[PDB]
Design an enzyme around this catalytic site. Structure first.
Site, short mmCIF file in Angstrom:
data_model
loop_
_atom_site.label_atom_id
_atom_site.label_comp_id
_atom_site.label_asym_id
_atom_site.label_seq_id
_atom_site.Cartn_x
_atom_site.Cartn_y
_atom_site.Cartn_z
N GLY A 223 -23.97 -27.82 -4.93
CA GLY A 223 -25.21 -28.01 -4.20
C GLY A 223 -25.31 -28.19 -2.66
CD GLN A 224 -26.66 -27.19 2.25
OE1 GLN A 224 -26.33 -25.34 1.87
NE2 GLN A 224 -25.93 -27.69 3.24
N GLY A 225 -25.19 -29.75 0.23
CA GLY A 225 -24.93 -30.97 1.00
C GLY A 225 -25.80 -30.61 3.00
CB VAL B 218 -21.39 -29.80 -2.67
CG1 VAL B 218 -20.22 -31.07 -3.55
CG2 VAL B 218 -22.14 -31.26 -1.55
CG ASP C 261 -29.90 -43.10 2.62
OD1 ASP C 261 -31.39 -43.18 2.45
OD2 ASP C 261 -30.08 -41.41 3.36
NE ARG D 40 -32.58 -39.70 -0.47
CZ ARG D 40 -33.76 -41.26 -0.42
NH1 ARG D 40 -34.34 -41.40 -0.85
NH2 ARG D 40 -33.51 -42.27 0.75
CG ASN D 41 -28.24 -41.54 -1.22
OD1 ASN D 41 -28.29 -39.99 -1.53
ND2 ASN D 41 -29.02 -41.99 -0.04
CG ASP E 188 -24.71 -40.19 -0.54
OD1 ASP E 188 -24.43 -38.90 0.88
OD2 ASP E 188 -24.99 -41.13 0.46
#
Ligand SMILES: N#Cc1ccc2[nH]cc(CCCCN3CCC(NC(=O)c4cccc5c(C#N)c[nH]c45)CC3)c2c1
Ligand SMILES: N#Cc1ccc2[nH]cc(CCCCN3CCC(NC(=O)c4cccc5c(C#N)c[nH]c45)CC3)c2c1
Length: 292
Positions: free
Chosen positions: A24-26, A31, A144, A148-149, A162
């Protein structure tokens, strides 16, 4: 230090890296999953995640990407995703990381929606708190922390980690009045924009709430500006439906308005260590010789 990255013992020959598929887009580029030769003791080959810098990125952005890898060279904790290598010669720029096969925790929790036991929830809480205790002890403030992280391993071990979440499907978890994760931020951070170990603990309480709701959006129905006001004026998230009382009480400790009243991550682990599964004593920062 800024302006230049010096290649070192972490440099991996690009010929030793093969990319198999997109993950996926980092925040700096795509990535991938792949395989790297010679990055782990006693393994001829290892499955890895591979972050890239997009071709259109600036000179400065390449350095920011590399400095993020540089800071993690110091770290070695079971509950923090490991750096494995860097390719800084030629293009594309790459960073090689420990592969977490079940992905990010927010996505994982949402996938379970049509329920994890209290014991499961406690294990995740303690793993996350332990990785955070390690980072904070090493003078690293995360800034953060969020489901999600956090990432999930093949054996369901949760680790801090992440690839940059600001540019894919959880982009709406950030507000740009720099991008700020406002639904995860402490009242004092919302007011003055400074982050501390105390504000990481606030965010941890939100992560518990995410676990307990299978990753609902915190403060659903309020706009970003309405969240800022609500939290700064002493408002809190509601107890999730069917939430174990011990988990909600932990949330409430993390969400003390006064940062100095909150527990440290070490104190959080102390309060739940009796419920941690056999094995935690052997791999945790909390029980290690380093914790002193
Ligand atoms: N390469 C690599 C690599 C290798 C192994 C790893 N294991 C765990 C991680 C992720 C660690 C967390 C790192 N992230 C923490 C928040 C940072 N945020 C900022 O650096 C930042 C940048 C600009 C404005 C603000 C801001 C405001 N306003 C608050 N934070 C920032 C971005 C990196 C990791 C990364
Ligand atoms: N949402 C959700 C969700 C869904 C499914 C889940 N299954 C388990 C969890 C809780 C997370 C904790 C994962 N744990 C699984 C057992 C592992 N323990 C071991 O792997 C182990 C423990 C003790 C000695 C040895 C040993 C030796 N010698 C080799 N492995 C071990 C540690 C992480 C979980 C959470």
């Amino acid at each position: 230090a800024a302006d230049v990255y010096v290649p070192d013992e972490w440099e991996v020959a690009r010929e030793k890296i093969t990319m198999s598929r997109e993950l996926g887009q980092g925040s700096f580029g795509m990535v991938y999953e792949g395989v790297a030769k010679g990055v782990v003791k006693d393994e001829p080959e290892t499955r890895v995640a591979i972050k890239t810098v997009n071709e259109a990125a600036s000179m400065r952005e390449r350095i920011e990407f590399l400095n993020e890898a540089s800071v993690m060279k110091e770290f070695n904790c079971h509950h923090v995703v490991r750096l494995l290598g860097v390719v800084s010669q030629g293009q594309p720029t790459l960073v090689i990381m420990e592969l977490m096969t079940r992905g990010d925790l927010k996505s994982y929790l949402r996938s379970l929606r049509p329920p994890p036991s209290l014991s499961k929830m406690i294990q995740m809480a303690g793993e996350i708190a332990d990785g955070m205790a390690y980072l904070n002890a090493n003078k690293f403030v995360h800034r953060d922390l969020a489901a999600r992280n956090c990432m999930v391993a093949e054996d369901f071990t949760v680790k801090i980690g992440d690839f940059g979440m600001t540019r894919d499907i959880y982009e709406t978890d950030y507000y740009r009045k720099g991008l700020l994760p406002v639904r995860w931020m402490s009242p004092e951070s919302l007011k003055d924009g400074v982050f501390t170990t105390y504000s990481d603990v606030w965010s941890f309480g939100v992560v518990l709430w995410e676990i307990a709701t299978l990753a609902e959006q915190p403060y659903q129905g309020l706009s970003n500006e309405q969240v800022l006001r609500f939290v700064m004026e002493g408002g809190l998230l509601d107890k999730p439906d069917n939430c174990p009382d011990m988990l909600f009480e932990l949330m409430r400790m993390c969400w003390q308005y006064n940062p100095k009243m909150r527990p440290s991550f070490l104190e959080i682990i102390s309060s739940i260590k009796e419920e941690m599964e056999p094995g935690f004593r052997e791999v945790s920062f909390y029980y290690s010789e380093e914790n002193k």
